[PDB]
Amino acid sequence: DILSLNIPHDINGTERSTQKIQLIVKSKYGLDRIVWDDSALRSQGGQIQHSGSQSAQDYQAILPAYVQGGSNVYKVTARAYDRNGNSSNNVLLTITVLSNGQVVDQVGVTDFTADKTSAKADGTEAITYTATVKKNGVAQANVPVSFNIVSGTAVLSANSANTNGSGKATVTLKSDKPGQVVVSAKTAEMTSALNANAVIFVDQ
Ligand SMILES: [Br-]
Ligand SMILES: [Br-]
Ligand SMILES: [Cl-]
Ligand SMILES: [Cl-]
Ligand SMILES: [Cl-]
Ligand code: NA
């Protein structure tokens, strides 16, 4: 009744982008300032800063670079103060960082990796690929993933599989010919498939 702060929306954005923060303040005596703990962002070189306008509630987040294999989720807090020195609750804002190649709010393949970098070219040894599907960093269950050989000569065990409860779908690759092979994974919302790193089948 005297002073409240609400943050209606968390932030999901591309690494190194600037993201405006929406604050909703109600203050009987008048807002004086917002005070932030952004130490989680600063651990990776991001920050929360005033947008430079004349408004005491106009802030933005500078997102850090994406950390491969990292959390990429940053929890920061804001507290409003009024002109009498009262404060609001210390309110949580969650900032999730996506890599340059990913799309905010999309159900998309974020990772597509193989268990081996090489295999024998005997048409028998299998390289197993795992695709992870997330939306804003959260794994998505039961999503169909389409698999395709982009280049090279090989055979996929299947052309589509649905993700499990951990957001993962798998397929195997075999080849009778030596050479490099690139396999890709895609979900329906993506604009193009995500290529895995090349693997090589070797004669021996
Ligand atoms: Br809220
Ligand atoms: Br697809
Ligand atoms: Cl509050
Ligand atoms: Cl090998
Ligand atoms: Cl999708
Ligand atoms: Na919120």
From 116, 189, 196, 115, select the one nearest 152 (Cα to Cα): 196
Interval between CA 36 and ligand 6 midpoint (Å): 15
| Residue matched to tokens 């004086």 | 32
From 156, 130, 133, select the one nearest 144 (Cα to Cα): 133
Resolution (Å units)? 1.5
| Residue matched to tokens 């690139």 | 182
Residues 78 and 7: their CA atoms lie apart, in Å, by 9
Ligand nearest to the CA of 189: 5
Residues 109 and 9: their CA atoms lie apart, in Å, by 24
**Resolved by:** X-ray
